[PDB]
Design an enzyme around this catalytic site. Structure first.
Site, PDB file in Angstrom:
ATOM      1  N   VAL A 112      47.052  42.318  32.701  1.00 17.57           N
ATOM      2  CA  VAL A 112      45.887  41.537  33.091  1.00 17.57           C
ATOM      3  C   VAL A 112      44.978  42.346  34.012  1.00 17.57           C
ATOM      4  O   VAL A 112      45.406  42.820  35.069  1.00 17.57           O
ATOM      5  CB  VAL A 112      46.298  40.232  33.798  1.00 17.57           C
ATOM      6  N   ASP A 159      57.551  26.996  32.267  1.00 22.02           N
ATOM      7  CA  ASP A 159      57.838  28.112  33.177  1.00 22.02           C
ATOM      8  C   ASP A 159      57.074  28.014  34.483  1.00 22.02           C
ATOM      9  O   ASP A 159      56.406  28.963  34.893  1.00 22.02           O
ATOM     10  CB  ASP A 159      57.558  29.476  32.516  1.00 22.02           C
ATOM     11  N   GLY A 197      47.896  43.287  37.407  1.00 25.08           N
ATOM     12  CA  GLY A 197      49.223  43.829  37.184  1.00 25.08           C
ATOM     13  C   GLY A 197      49.785  43.718  35.774  1.00 25.08           C
ATOM     14  O   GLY A 197      49.249  43.018  34.910  1.00 25.08           O
ATOM     15  N   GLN A 198      50.880  44.437  35.558  1.00 27.39           N
ATOM     16  CA  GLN A 198      51.691  44.305  34.354  1.00 27.39           C
ATOM     17  C   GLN A 198      52.754  43.242  34.600  1.00 27.39           C
ATOM     18  O   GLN A 198      53.802  43.534  35.177  1.00 27.39           O
ATOM     19  CB  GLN A 198      52.370  45.640  34.039  1.00 27.39           C
ATOM     20  N   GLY A 199      52.486  42.014  34.169  1.00 31.25           N
ATOM     21  CA  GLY A 199      53.435  40.941  34.402  1.00 31.25           C
ATOM     22  C   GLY A 199      53.398  39.843  33.356  1.00 31.25           C
ATOM     23  O   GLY A 199      52.508  38.990  33.374  1.00 31.25           O
ATOM     24  N   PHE A 202      54.359  40.793  30.120  1.00 34.49           N
ATOM     25  CA  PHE A 202      54.350  40.753  28.662  1.00 34.49           C
ATOM     26  C   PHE A 202      52.937  41.070  28.198  1.00 34.49           C
ATOM     27  O   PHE A 202      52.594  40.912  27.023  1.00 34.49           O
ATOM     28  CB  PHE A 202      54.755  39.354  28.181  1.00 34.49           C
ATOM     29  N   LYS A 212      43.442  39.093  29.888  1.00 33.91           N
ATOM     30  CA  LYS A 212      44.860  39.256  29.635  1.00 33.91           C
ATOM     31  C   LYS A 212      44.995  39.955  28.295  1.00 33.91           C
ATOM     32  O   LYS A 212      44.487  39.472  27.288  1.00 33.91           O
ATOM     33  CB  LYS A 212      45.531  37.883  29.597  1.00 33.91           C
TER      34      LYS A 212
END
Lengths: 320, 322
Positions: free
Chosen positions: A26, A140, A19-21, A23, A42
């Site tokens: 991947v 995070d 996915g696009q997650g 920033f 990534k």
């Protein structure tokens, strides 16, 4: 920004997305040079500062992987890196899905089995131990940044794009994602490994219940929800906070913002939140009790009263 | 060496004994200059070596009291000192009896209520906290040196006549009264505040059971009794020991000495036979507390002090937090 079938670095053939997650894209690839074994790649943003933090993420994983040669402390294992069309590309061990998406696959507010949570907690603490040993804050920690193998038995702490060394700790109230952001960040009091501990406690509750523990809409709403659990924030603490002002008056009262606009004042809050309740909807109960008690010891507002890593690791919930 | 009646320093009427604690007699007096308020006067012994640690004693108490103005940390409060017929005399707040004597008034192996024990546990850890904050080792914590008030709600850590600074760590295998002596002392490893925490652990057990935890007849027997609980000592630790050779062979196997003529038996592995929960043993509220005590004891009694639970962490333990 990458296409399926594309071969990267003359070996990695991209056959799909994780996915696009959020920033960096991947992808899942197979590695021609290694019997077509699976990897994740990534691909960092085309971007002036995104790549600064990507190079950061590289260094932190090196030290962390260097420090864990036999890989027993559950951080994502970095293989190598290269460049493709001006993007820094990091190659990781393949890992099926993050805990956010396993939690969704479990259904509205269901949560994981207490067996699973129990095992996961131990792995996350081992991860906290490895971090502290390296003097790193991950900063995070939440379900979205925790990955697991196909069998779902092993987890890995990933995405070190927010990480920092303990020493440079900037004074910003917006460190860590809001729902997992500890009170010493918000208030402006100096902070360390304890924020990672706080986050873990936040996600453990979420792993078992399926619910966000502190869905606060702002920093003020966050501190409020925290103090709905442990009562009001300690006074010596309130005072050490560079932002105490933004949240309390000189009578050390908590100023709680509301709806049009409202600004109530509270001298004490009085715990409203029943963890043990939430940790149940409808010997198994045994462990749920232990977990609640565990959550109680790690979600202390003053970082200095927060359970240590080794005591967490040693806690009754872990030891079964 | 004193007579009831004898007034000391022109103000203290000595009227009874608490006794010859060990290294100096301690008597009860009233202070004429203060409406006859009750005090304890400790009279250090003539000897030039003993009064040398009496100066040391005075020193550590001043420091500890100095660093604890509000008396939140449960060390004996010194009022002042004078001299008498060449003895240093320390004047303390008056205190009823030690935990040795309260334990005896409870009867054989009865111990105190778990409520009292957990109350005392917190107060003891508080004292441990002050000690570390002042870089002092007490080095003789045990029921005998822990005093309590009339109503037994409050205790004080006392008798700082074995105390030392952390920095000048004499390698002797005989620091601390044997039953409360940590394995790092015996093995000759380097030691710090950890030895006081170990001692506290031993007395908490003893506080609840009425029993001595490690009644070892020799250093070698103590190590044996401690590995019965925790298993064999870590090799990493056995090596750091200056007196390892007395207890462990070249292969790091424990050499257990017994009499009758001294025989030695070697054990390569030693698996835990000591069952803490079953010792240390009524209702589910209590039972849950006692399990907590058992969990807390297990963190305290880690053979390697490096792994031993910290003071702040102990204070935050579930057993304490109620």
């Amino acid at each position: 920004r990458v296409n399926i079938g594309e071969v990267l670095d003359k070996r990695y053939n991209v056959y799909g997305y994780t996915g696009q997650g959020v920033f960096s894209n991947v992808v899942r690839a197979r590695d021609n040079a290694r019997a077509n074994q699976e990897v994740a790649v990534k691909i960092i943003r085309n971007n002036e500062l995104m790549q600064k933090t990507g190079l950061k993420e590289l260094e932190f994983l090196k030290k962390l992987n260097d420090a864990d040669p036999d890989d027993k402390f559950h951080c994502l294992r970095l293989f190598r890196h290269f460049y493709h069309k001006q993007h820094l590309c990091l190659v990781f061990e393949p890992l099926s899905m993050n805990l956010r998406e396993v939690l969704k696959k479990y259904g509205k507010d269901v949560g994981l089995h207490i067996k699973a949570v129990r095992s996961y907690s131990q792995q996350l603490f081992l991860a906290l131990k490895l971090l502290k040993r390296c003097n790193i804050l991950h900063a995070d920690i939440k379900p979205d940044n925790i990955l697991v193998n196909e069998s779902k038995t092993i987890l890995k702490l990933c995405d070190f794009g927010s990480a920092s060394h303990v020493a440079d700790n900037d004074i910003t109230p917006y460190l860590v994602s809001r729902f997992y952001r500890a009170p010493e960040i918000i208030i402006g009091k100096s902070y360390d490994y304890g924020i990672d501990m706080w986050s873990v406690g936040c996600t453990l509750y979420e792993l078992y219940t399926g619910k966000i523990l502190f869905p606060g809409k702002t920093n003020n709403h966050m501190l409020k929800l925290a103090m709905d659990l442990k009562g009001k924030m300690p006074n010596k603490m309130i005072r050490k906070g560079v932002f105490k002002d933004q949240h309390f008056d000189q009578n050390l009262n908590f100023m709680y913002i509301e709806v049009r606009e409202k600004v109530t004042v509270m001298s004490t809050i009085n715990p409203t939140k029943d963890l043990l309740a939430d940790l149940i909807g409808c010997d198994q109960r045994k462990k749920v009790h232990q977990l609640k008690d565990l959550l109680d010891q790690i979600l202390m507002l003053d970082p200095a009263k927060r359970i240590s890593i080794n005591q967490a690791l040693q806690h009754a919930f872990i030891q079964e």
